[PDB]
Amino acid sequence: KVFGRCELAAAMKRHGLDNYRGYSLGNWVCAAKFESNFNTQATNRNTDGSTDYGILQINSRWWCNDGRTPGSRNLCNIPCSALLSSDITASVNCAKKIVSDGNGMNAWVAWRNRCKGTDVQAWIRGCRL
Ligand SMILES: [Cl-]
Ligand SMILES: [Cl-]
Ligand SMILES: [Cl-]
Ligand code: NA
Ligand code: NA
């Protein structure tokens, strides 16, 4: 599914991401925009052979099992394909683990480089929330 900006904001809010670990909703929307262009089906391979999945580009090296990332962890205890669903629940639940692991949203390179330090509230401006 390709979410609209406000549609995703509302879904993320409903799933408890607003202010989760201190990160306002606009951070999460911004991260999703630049990680996946709001596309739940986005996948991208990494140099190391892991792959990033879904709207938040969660990495099979650590977070999910895709069966082809040898020696990797599955800290979210999910098949990576679950992160591609139109239902963002699995992505959100796994993102909550990631963001809680000590590094905050710096786990998401696009967030670091394109959202952090910007007016992220712009990403939810105009949305009925
Ligand atoms: Cl915000
Ligand atoms: Cl694997
Ligand atoms: Cl933090
Ligand atoms: Na992979
Ligand atoms: Na994801």
Side-chain angles (χ1 to χ4, degrees):
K1 176 173 169 162
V2 179
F3 275 82
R5 174 178 64 91
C6 295
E7 186 189 15
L8 179 64
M12 281 177 155
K13 167 148 198 210
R14 165 171 109 80
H15 282 97
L17 280 183
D18 189 12
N19 297 319
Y20 192 87
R21 282 279 165 138
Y23 287 91
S24 65
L25 189 58
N27 281 286
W28 296 102
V29 173
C30 184
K33 165 70 174 183
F34 294 123
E35 288 292 348
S36 67
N37 213 10
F38 300 146
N39 182 1
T40 64
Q41 296 195 72
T43 60
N44 286 292
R45 196 93 184 248
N46 301 313
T47 306
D48 68 358
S50 62
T51 301
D52 293 346
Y53 293 89
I55 203 147
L56 283 167
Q57 290 292 280
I58 289 175
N59 192 338
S60 64
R61 167 75 44 209
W62 303 101
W63 302 109
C64 60
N65 179 40
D66 65 5
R68 64 168 202 197
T69 311
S72 72
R73 306 259 279 268
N74 178 9
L75 300 165
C76 290
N77 291 122
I78 52 156
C80 298
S81 59
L83 300 173
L84 305 178
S85 179
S86 59
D87 179 346
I88 65 167
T89 298
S91 284
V92 164
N93 289 333
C94 183
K96 285 179 174 176
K97 295 202 176 71
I98 297 170
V99 75
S100 295
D101 73 6
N103 290 327
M105 285 195 75
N106 293 297
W108 287 279
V109 60
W111 178 84
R112 283 209 315 273
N113 288 330
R114 305 178 75 175
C115 301
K116 184 178 190 178
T118 75
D119 173 25
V120 295
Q121 183 282 327
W123 287 99
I124 61 159
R125 194 164 300 150
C127 302
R128 206 159 26 213
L129 297 167

